[PDB]
Amino acid sequence: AEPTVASVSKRIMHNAYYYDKDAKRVGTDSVKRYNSVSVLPNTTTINGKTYYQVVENGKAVDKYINAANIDGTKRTLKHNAYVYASSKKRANKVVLKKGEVVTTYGASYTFKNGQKYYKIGDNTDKTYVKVANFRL
Ligand SMILES: [Cl-]
Ligand SMILES: [Cl-]
Ligand SMILES: [Cl-]
Ligand SMILES: [Cl-]
């Protein structure tokens, strides 16, 4: 009966638009990683994509966040991979191995070197893996 008793505060892991039920961007705001937003805990599906419905001022509103930006996407490495903070800087000494399941959070990032990277890790750390390592 009260959306604000049911709501959970999810951490945004990739900057996120608000969408309406027609999967069109609504308004001019976006939630920035790694801020949190109040949503209903059960996802819904709009045009074959998974979303969380926003709760604002006591009510479930016609504003939806793509679950890719909160839960991310489970992916498998097709190649061994390093973890990068930026184009040239390694984040750590980890070697992720071919076949490992890794969750990536939202759309890839093109770095200054022109290569694409996904954010990994259930945390605010600057830890990115090359998109190429998820493809054959
Ligand atoms: Cl944005
Ligand atoms: Cl988005
Ligand atoms: Cl690599
Ligand atoms: Cl963290």
Numbering used by the authors: 310 to 445
What do the authors say?
S-layer proteins (SLPs) are self-assembling, crystalline proteins coating the cell surfaces of many prokaryotes. We determined the atomic resolution structures of all functional domains (I-III from N- to C-termini) present in the three S-layer proteins SlpA_ac, SlpX_ac, and SlpA_amy. The Lactobacillus S-layers are anchored to the cell wall through interaction with teichoic acids (TA), either lipoteichoic acid (LTA) or wall teichoic acid (WTA).
The SlpA protein (~46 kDa) is the main structural component of Lactobacillus acidophilus ATCC 4356 S-layer, built of two domains. The N-terminal region is involved in the self-assembly of the S-layer, whereas the C-terminal part is involved in the attachment to the cell wall. The amino acid sequence of the C-terminal SlpA_III domain is sequentially conserved among Lactobacillus. It consists of two adjacent repeats of the “SlpA-motif,” the “Surface layer protein A motif/domain” (InterPro: IPR024968). This domain is involved in the binding to TAs (teichoic acid binding domain; TAB domain), one of the components of the bacterial cell wall. The crystal structures of the TAB domains (SlpA_ac_III, SlpA_amy_III, and SlpX_ac_III) reveal high structural similarities. The general structure of the TAB domain consists of two cell wall binding motifs (SlpA_motif) which are connected by a short linker and arranged as an internal homodimer. Mapping of the surface charges indicates a large, highly positively charged region within the interface of the two motifs that extends to the C-terminal part of the protein. The four residues observed in the vicinity of phosphates are conserved with the proposed binding motif of YxY….KxxN. SlpA_III, the teichoic acid binding domain, is not involved in the self-assembly and protrudes inward to the bacterial cell.
